[PDB]
């Protein structure tokens, strides 16, 4: 979280 900030 935020799931966008991790690949």
């Amino acid at each position, epitope marked *: 979280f935020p*799931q966008f900030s991790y690949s």
Partner: single-chain antibody
Amino acid sequence: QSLEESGGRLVTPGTPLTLTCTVSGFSLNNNAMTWVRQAPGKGLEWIGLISRSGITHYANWAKGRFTISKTSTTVDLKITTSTTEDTATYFCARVDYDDYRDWGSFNVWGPGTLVTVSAAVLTQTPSSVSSAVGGTVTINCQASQSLYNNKNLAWYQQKPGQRPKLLIYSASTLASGVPSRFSGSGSGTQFTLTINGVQSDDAATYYCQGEFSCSSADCNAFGGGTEVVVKG
């Protein structure tokens, strides 16, 4: 509070091209940006997004043929190679999340920039509907997989030739300045948009949009949209 986009570009097949989205009244340091395209006469389709720290995510169709980069005030979309299938209006939009919660939605939209070159699905029904003024309109959105947080389904309105406008987010939350005659419901993989007392100004196309889990699917997708006509 506002996004600005570059002009319309008439290009040859096979030639690289960069679209710009300029941001007024916030920093991309604290905001994620997403790109969405729409070919003429057709519906919204998600391309990808850039996180606050700068991590990119693409739809599966788009991976490799689009690159999203940014500075603090501007985000870009490089089209590596341009085909006829890239003929579309490309919108940028602010991605609605912060450090505490993730609303899933896109709440500020650019005016779009036309480009003429010359799994997770949302099934949205019906494809079109006609309503008497004062009538009731239901639109259904059906996921193929549960959405991020179970409920990050948003609805947008789009009048012809105008950008999309956010109405409902997290399934049932009415956006700023949206009339209460709109309301949304559902959970899991079934959601409905209702218009109770439809008005001549409600004539538009409505898209549902769902946030999924990035590590099992495209991070977002849209329904195919519903054309709503109002008979008066």
